[PDB]
Amino acid sequence: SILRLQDAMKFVKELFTVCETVLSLNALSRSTGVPPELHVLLPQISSMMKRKIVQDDILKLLTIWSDAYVVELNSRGELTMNLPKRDNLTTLTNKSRTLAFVERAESWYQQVISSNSKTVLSSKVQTNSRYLANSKENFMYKEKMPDSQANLMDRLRERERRSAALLSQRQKRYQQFLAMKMTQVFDILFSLTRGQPYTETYLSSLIVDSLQDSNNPIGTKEASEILAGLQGILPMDISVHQVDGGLKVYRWNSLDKNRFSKLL
Amino acid sequence: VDDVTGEKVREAFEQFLEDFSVQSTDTGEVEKVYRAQIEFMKIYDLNTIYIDYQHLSMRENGALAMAISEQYYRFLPFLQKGLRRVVRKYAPELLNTSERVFQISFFNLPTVHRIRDIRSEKIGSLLSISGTVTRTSEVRPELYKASFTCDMCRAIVDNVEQSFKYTEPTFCPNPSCENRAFWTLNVTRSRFLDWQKVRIQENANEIPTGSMPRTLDVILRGDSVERAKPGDRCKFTGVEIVVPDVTQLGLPGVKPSSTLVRDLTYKISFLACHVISIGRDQEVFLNSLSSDEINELKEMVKDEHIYDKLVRSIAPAVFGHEAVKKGILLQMLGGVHKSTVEGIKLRGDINICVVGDPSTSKSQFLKYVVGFAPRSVYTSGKASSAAGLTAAVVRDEEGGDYTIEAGALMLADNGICCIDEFDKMDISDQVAIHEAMEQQTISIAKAGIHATLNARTSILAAANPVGGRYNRKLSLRGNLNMTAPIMSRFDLFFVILDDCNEKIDTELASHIVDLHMKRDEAIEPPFSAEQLRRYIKYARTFKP
Amino acid sequence: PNVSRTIARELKSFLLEYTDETGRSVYGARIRTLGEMNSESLEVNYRHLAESKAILALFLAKCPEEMLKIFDLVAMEATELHYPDYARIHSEIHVRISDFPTIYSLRELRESNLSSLVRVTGVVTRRTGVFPQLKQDSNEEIRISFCTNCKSKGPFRVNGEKTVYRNYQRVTLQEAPGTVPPGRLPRHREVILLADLVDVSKPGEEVEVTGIYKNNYDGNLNAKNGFPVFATIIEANSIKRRSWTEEEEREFRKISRDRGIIDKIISSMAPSIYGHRDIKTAVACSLFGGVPKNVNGKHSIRGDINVLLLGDPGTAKSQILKYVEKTAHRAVFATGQGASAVGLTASVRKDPITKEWTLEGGALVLADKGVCLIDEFDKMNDQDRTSIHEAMEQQSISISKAGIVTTLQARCSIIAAANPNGGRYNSTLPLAQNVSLTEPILSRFDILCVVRDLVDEEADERLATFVVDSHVRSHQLNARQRRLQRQRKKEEEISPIPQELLMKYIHYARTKIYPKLHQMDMDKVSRVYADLRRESISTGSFPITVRHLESILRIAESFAKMRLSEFVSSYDLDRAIKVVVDSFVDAQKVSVRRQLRRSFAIY
């Protein structure tokens, strides 16, 4: 047994007799360079034999005759294999390859006879941010250390003061917020809408429900403000004058903009 | 000049995707970007390349992009041909392809259009359309360029069809003869691309409340096929071509014919090249949002009493009900719906279900939410039917086959689908909901089609108690008139009462009056009904 | 390939004069089997031809149909030079090929693959009858240049007859249910059946086709004149109605040879459920299935369990059957809302657009050799109930309808999640009165999972801990390693067998093992059955019939499959009797407590 059961080369050499074929088959059907992932070709050759076929069988094929293929591994973490020939095939070349392969297997047989057609090793290559959470502030009524006197009125005596700034500050925030929005609006109406008599309601209801249905929404009257701001920061072309209801807007003439957007 | 116009378009466009389109480097992606797109494409079999439109605008001050947009269909073959001159150089995919086809699909357009904005003036132009799909059609292979074989010369002709009628050469280009006998079509040497036709309809946000939503039919070609799914909101992008329909006769009348031949009857149909269907991700949503608006959120989230500032600012008109308003604010902010171990998946959504005595302003909450919650739907229920509510089966003449109607539930995906008067809805329709409550997905086996569509939809309710108003005398058991399950699946419950008082009814009356006194619209809550939307669209992403 | 005369010669070198392993020509046998069988269809063992000449095999990509059409005519002249009578016997012979390694699933087909050879799996959704297909308009009927007397506008009418007719059966093939990811409608592909392959297949049954992938049009224009309806159609060339690694099954046995498997499986049957071992047990039992046994003597009795789960709000029954949908092999989930009896069972219709008779596999048909999972029974019309009762009794669906006659087979088991009339369990009141389902369909089922929700100060606390930990555990190459292994650590937080092991396990079981019985206890279990009959006549009314007995062995064989015994064991049969007797116990009235002792003689 120990001397002859190791004569199971037929059960592995036959793998080389057909693999290339299906490989060639894929090669002759795939114009993408026929990249191979064993998770598909392995079931294919399995069906081609109906036997259990695992990557170890390809590893034994590599062990017996390592030059007939490339066995590199994909960057995703999968080991692939392609053909060394620079054209498809000449079936006589394939026949001679199978012949020299079985001859190599017989050389292995002789020079070995212990060794049960072991496997070769693989040729391995060498290889806070404004997350607005608040997980602590909700802990408990920790706010118990400061046992101050009526000094709190002191703080409050300044509170109203900041209420003047704070409010106005919030106001400037829109002077800020709306600002960034209009940075795209002079490319919203511009880049698509060259109808000259455009009104206000239509253009607004276009702005809302435009890309402002994505991550960053906006409201209607806010769109009206955006329009008023665009006109004011560019009265050269954009001329808006109201008739009875709704301010009709001008006839577009496509300037360059950021040169004035810097005036935030 | 139009020849050299298209040729200048070619030069400019080849130049654009030639040099870098993205300035970023060392922090984002490499300078040259569409070269990298081509490289990615060459290894695989993408068969099409997407390019930004903003960059096109940023190429030649928009002039190039403007020209591409205004008149587009004239340039589709022009630009598709210009693309080869590039790709032949860098990636030799095309000779190894043995095929020469690339759907140059645009995306990220600056100005979406509601579907009723579609005119004929926009013919042949490029445009983006928001909407809701419905009744997809099965994909069918469509011929693009065919090989006609001469009847006697038997020569090959690379004849191009234009989705109009069988085209055909006139003289056999084989100069051996100039015959006119019908060149024999071939299917083998004929590259055909399958396309799927979906009926898109206008959504609710843009239609004025009270008007029937117009629709249309759009066609998806190339790899864009199968990307649609009944119910999914989409923002298609592509051409606005017209297809001839011989089926238009009679009532219009005057329509002309091609006589100095037969009447050319036409109908509009968008043809979309690219589809987008979306609707720890703060890594995405935040940096996606510009630094400015970060300040606005920063404010509306760093304030201490937001959770209170919010809840008393969800029903500006309604008076009080700080219980229910809370129940709604939590509705629009779903759970996590994260699946379990590969075993099963569990629901992550909330279903508040008000039940109130008369004049409790329970329909106001709905006819508000459905106007403030994104992608929502309001159905009186008793007028509707169970089949309509979950999914409909209907026949289509395209392939003579049965298919799906999205319905309220599927087109209400990822949004609140409010309802009225459950009690009035006979059980025959109460039943059709259950699977859209806990199992979260509908499953249908009718007329041969077996399918299952996931409906991740919050629901609601406003049914009235059995006797209109319910006896305080009686208990609650024999008082709701609804079975155990649908009584359980509602992960809230609000039996709203209505009782007499003075220090309440005076306030309520003053409030309603102030409402009817338009001038006294002091109703301004802290947070507008708009900044609440953006604040949500942020908070929807935490999955604690 | 015009000079291909010499190429046909070179491939006909393999024609007869090839043998192997002590002669015995692969086709020297086939030619005489045809001369004696007259089946006008050659087999082509692709395994051996692949060894013969690589170029010939590879020629199945450029002009594969042209290649095969050249090949089969010379095969015809070959069997004719061997049998000069054979050419006159039949009209023409087309070959068939054995097997390919190309297993492109229906979800994967590209333009590169079309016009080439493809071997696909799937299920026959529905089929049609024989067509006399059309196939100077030879088969155009859309191309008429000047062949009309009034050709300006006065229309000339061609007939649709006197034209060549090909045996033509258009079969719809769809992706295997269960494998279809949730949400996506399964693809449809029209495969074509011809002279030898006509009617060789039914719906509801697994198939594997080997035909080419044509881009052919259909003359049913229906859209525009010079525009037929183009379908990417598979042309069938061979049909197969029908593995894993050795040490796989080896360690598999190593596990299944333990003593805890019959309960480790249970405790791993449900990933995220607390309690309900009894219901999980019945789930596992009707999941594994038992060995069926045809009976030409009296009536074929299937060995397939049918669990009815009389649920109650709150108890995770629909989650159980959803798990089952995922884990089992042939799950067909269908709820009693979109019942439409025509849908559950098979039906036969005429299509309005093409005026063609088709018959479409139903949920029971689409589930054959698997599990059909239905729920909300009491929420479906009674006619659905009647049709399903019929199907369960005959475990199949005969049909003899307008223009068609056949008998589909629907072995597939049924799991059913119910809901008692009105609300919950009223009381210990009888199960029948507690549900609006008919006694016949009740007896059609064997196992009745009676679940109940009851308030408890403690058991609910532990259950709650469990559920909360469940919602806690829910939520490059080395990152994927660290992720897969962490998912497996969570697979081990539910300590018994991981899932993938268990689905491979159920596949292995329902494939290989087919246990049987010994004479020893079958008459002593009939003794126990008689004792049950006396405890049931002491109960007044009761459905204790042959079904109630046969269920016992039908469950014990499943238990043997669990143990992989090939023959029933003692402890397994005792488990079976326990499950059946107490499932019965639950159905009964107050007597239940008395019953706990009355029929206790077993335990």
Ligand SMILES: Nc1ncnc2c1ncn2[C@@H]1O[C@H](COP(=O)(O)OP(=O)(O)OP(O)(O)=S)[C@@H](O)[C@H]1O
């Ligand atoms: N709490 C409230 N505060 C102010 N106005 C209210 C309030 N409740 C009701 N109303 C007004 O009274 C009208 C009746 O409101 P609802 O009772 O919600 O009507 P509804 O939704 O049709 O009720 P049912 O049950 O369907 S008949 C509404 O138009 C409200 O404007």
Ligand SMILES: Nc1ncnc2c1ncn2[C@@H]1O[C@H](COP(=O)(O)OP(=O)(O)OP(O)(O)=S)[C@@H](O)[C@H]1O
């Ligand atoms: N042991 C358990 N562990 C975890 N969740 C459980 C358990 N038992 C019940 N559940 C819950 O039960 C839910 C699903 O129960 P279902 O079987 O769907 O009840 P149900 O049959 O749908 O109720 P009906 O059909 O409307 S009467 C899960 O989402 C869980 O929340």
